[PDB]
Amino acid sequence: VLSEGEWQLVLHVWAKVEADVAGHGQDILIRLFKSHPETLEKFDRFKHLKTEAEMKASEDLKKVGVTALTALGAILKKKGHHEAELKPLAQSXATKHKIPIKYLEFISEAIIHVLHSRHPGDFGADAQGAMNKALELFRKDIAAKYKELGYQGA
């Protein structure tokens, strides 16, 4: 759905994410919670984590962020051919954690913010646009799968 060059921009900056997945995952979750604190209500085990320091010191939080970014990394590496990887995640999101699509918009914003804050030399305008399209496609395809399951995502 993207150009091949756009996918290389997405996977180039993703290679920089992979140099430190746990750190990126902490930054991305903490950014999400800062910008949209209503998202923290979905994480029953992280409600007692009151400061950014406490969140960064939580191996639980750190593990969740690695799982979530590993899943996204696997999907991004498919270059759009991700229906097999996306269905189980849609099933989990839709019928277990109950994540509205807007929350995936929020965490997509967090991802764009953290990656540009850490790798501006690897994440200019063209690369942000590529990743934005990639995350858009992830979100749209997952929302289709939500409907398929009988949840509309809001």
Residues near ligand HEM (CB under 6 A) are: 39, 42-43, 45, 64, 67-68, 71-72, 89, 92, 97, 99, 103-104, 107
CB 42 → ligand HEM: shortest distance, Å? 4
> Considering beta carbons, is residue 42 or 140 the nearer one to ligand HEM?
42
> Considering beta carbons, is residue 39 or 127 the nearer one to ligand HEM?
39
> Considering beta carbons, is residue 121 or 129 the nearer one to ligand HEM?
129
CB 123 → ligand HEM: shortest distance, Å? 17
> Considering beta carbons, is residue 48 or 121 the nearer one to ligand HEM?
48
CB 111 → ligand HEM: shortest distance, Å? 7
The whole-angstrom separation of Cα 114 and Cα 65 is 13
- Using CB positions, name the residue nearest to ligand HEM: 92
Nearest one of 135, 137, 121, 126 to 16, comparing CA atoms? 121
CA distances to 3, 30, 56, 86, 111 from 81, in Å: 13, 30, 34, 10, 21
Report which residue type is found at 17: V
CB 110 → ligand HEM: shortest distance, Å? 8
CB 97 → ligand HEM: shortest distance, Å? 4
Q: Where are the alpha helices (DSSP H) in the chain?
A: 4-18, 21-35, 52-56, 59-76, 83-92, 101-118, 125-149
> Considering beta carbons, is residue 76 or 121 the nearer one to ligand HEM?
76
The whole-angstrom separation of Cα 145 and Cα 86 is 8
